[PDB]
Amino acid sequence: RCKTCSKGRCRPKPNCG
Numbered sequence: 001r002c003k004t005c006s007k008g009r010c011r012p013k014p015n016c017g
Contacts (some may be wrong), residue, residue: 002016 003013005011
């Protein structure tokens with residue numbers, strides 16, 4: 001549960017790929 005979805009956008013984490 002490291003990946004987070006921005007407000008409206010959904011992208012991978014910088015360190016948690």
